[PDB]
Structures are given as structure tokens and as C-alpha cells.
Chain A
């Protein structure tokens, strides 16, 4: 029962995304398959269903690492901490075993940490007001002394309750997360394909960020932020 927000826990947070997504599946999946097919792996809409479910179920699982809890307790600032990057190493191996390949596990491990605040891979002009910096987030990563035992079996508690594929969890201590979060970024940055590893990764990102209706609103432009939340007319009655 690890809480994910100030007053909202991760448990109801997951069902908030499912209750946002039961209708989004009939709009993007036929449109996401046709753009996914460029990478080489191909499957029907049924496999895409489970793929998008696996991505939505683990998107911010790194929020319980005895760091976010000790920061969002009363008033402690994050000090430029990134909560979800470690989730990437959780989203790398899980797709390795249930798809039995790598070409579709890599894109998942990227899209799972393209959200929230993506990492800026250099090439700055003269300034950066925000904290999109690998150098400052490595300092906050250095204090990651593993994860609590409460999340060791907790990962078995949401995958079996909806579909059920296979039980498997990794064991982060200091370095297995390191040489994976670095290798995924370095492989995604430099490949012969120039713009695919950007447009396709964003295309997979787009359905994952429907969380605004799931959580509490924070901006006045909510009307324009839910244009695709609805659909066309079904019938007259």
C-alpha cells in the first residue's frame, strides 16, 4: 500500500488509468500498429492490447523507493530527484520474457521513461531553467540503496489480477540499474535511423499520458487537454 500522490495511493491510481483507457483502446491501437510495424516486429491487435496494458501498468512504479515517500511526507523538496527512471530497468526485463525478443522490449524501456520529465542529451544554447540534466540526476541516483521488500512481491499483485502472464521481478542494488539505464539511452541516441526512434517513441508515449483525467486537475486548459477523450456519434437514440 505505497502511496503515489499527496493524497492518492498507487492502487486506485492504476484503476484511474484503466478507467481512462477502456475507451482509448478503440482509437489508437489500429493507428499504433501501423506505425509500430516499422521496427520489424509484427503482431495483431490482441498482442498490442497486452503490450499497452503492460506499459500502462508500469509507468511510474519507481515512485516507491524510500525517496519519494521521505520527500512528499510533509514539505521536503525533491532536490531534483527523478522517480521514474529506475522504472525503466523494471520495464526492460519484463518485456524480455513475455515477448521473447528485444526489438519490442527496447521501445518499451524507452517509452516508460520518456514521460514526466525526459532527459536532455546535451546540446544546450546558454541556459536551462528546468532540471533536465543527467549530471544533476546522477547525484540523486547515487543514493539509491535498493528498494524495499514491500515492493518485492507487490509487483506480483497487479499483473496476475487482470491478465496473468508470468511472475518475474529484478533485484536493484546499485549497478544493474546503472548499466541498463545508460545502455538504453546510448542505444536510443545513436542508430542509423534518424527520426524513427523519436516519432515512434512519442507515438507510444501519447496514449500513456492520458493520466490527467485519472488524477486531479492542475491547469485551467483542461477542455483542450481532453479533445480525444470522446468519440464520434454512435446512433441517434
Chain B
């Protein structure tokens, strides 16, 4: 078992949930956004295999390949090491996609996002071969923009790690399907995107106030036999 761990130090979030007027955002990036960000990196880097007429099937084939090289439906998990905070932004979201209402119809919608300082992303595989190991290592980097086209993410590093059954409490997200013994925190997460299903994941977010602010601290769930160590700070990963 090999886990590809990367670090994304991007200040403000990019994802927006299914919402109008306000644009609610996830506290941690959805797996679908990460799947898209990694899939789009293979096209401009390896265009000799991603031949498509349009973008609609171009995304579909890349997502299908990513799912094929995946152990299960669970795409990828993230670990926050910084206190998340829910910011407030007011953006322009024009509404002119209906059969009418002239051409210029734009008003202000509160498209607010979330701020973090440190974040890890752990992709999971099934001991892939070497000839594509380097390709995926190079593809893990070069993630300049995530979510929408207004915020940029900057990767830091990328390396493979073994579980080796080390003692550490769970830190990355995990689906809430059969895990009950692990203050518990689950929301709609939308691991699987749609292009014309919805699973519930456990997210490691808890609010703790010391004297002034509440932010989002760590819930420290019960220890899981699977975990990975990095830069001294060991974090627990849930593997099916």
C-alpha cells in the first residue's frame, strides 16, 4: 500500500456548493474538485493520449481513467492542519442563461469562501507499476488553480508513504457508511461529480474556543490502525 501525499498551501477556498444568492463552500475541498484538478493536469502535459472533440467527453474519459486506477469509489482525502475560517466575499454572478432576460443581467451575489493556511492531500492507489509512477508523480504537481478561476493553489511537495500500521488517531476524512465507533461531524460531500452518487463523509472539524475565537480545531477521533508519518506530525488515514 502506497499513499501519495502532497501539500497545498492555498489561502482561500474555491469550491462553491449548490446554492444561489449566497455561495456556501465546503470546509475541506471536495474529492470531485481534486479529481478534476488532477485530470486537467494530464491533458496539457500528456496530450498524445487525451484526444477529444470537446471538453465534455475530455473530462469524462479522464475521470473514468482515474476511477479505473482507483481502489474504490472513495477518490481522495484531505487533512487540515490550520484553523479554518469562513470568510465573506461579494462577487458578480450574472444571470443570463435563460431563454430571455436580454444579455446583460448581472447583480451582486455573496460568493463567500473559506480560509486555511496548511492542508495535506493524500491520494490512494493499489501499488501501481513504475512506468506510470513517475508520470503520476509529475502530474501531482503543477496544480496552479483549483475550483473556480479566481483563486490559485500552490503545491509544496509530493512523496509516497507506507502505512506500516503506526499508532496515530484518524486525521483525514472518511465516509460515514460503516464507521460508527470511529463530536461527530458529517455533511454532504459529493465525492462523485456529474456531467449530464452522493455519499456522506466524516470530516475532522470541531469548534473550540480558548478565550477569544472559535475557529475550527481538531476533534481527534479514536485511533485507526492505518496512518502515515510526515515531517514529524503523524496523521491517521482511513483505508477500506
Whether A and B touch directly in their complex, counting CB atoms under 8 A apart, is answered as no
Q: Which residues of B contact A (CB under 8 A)?
A: none
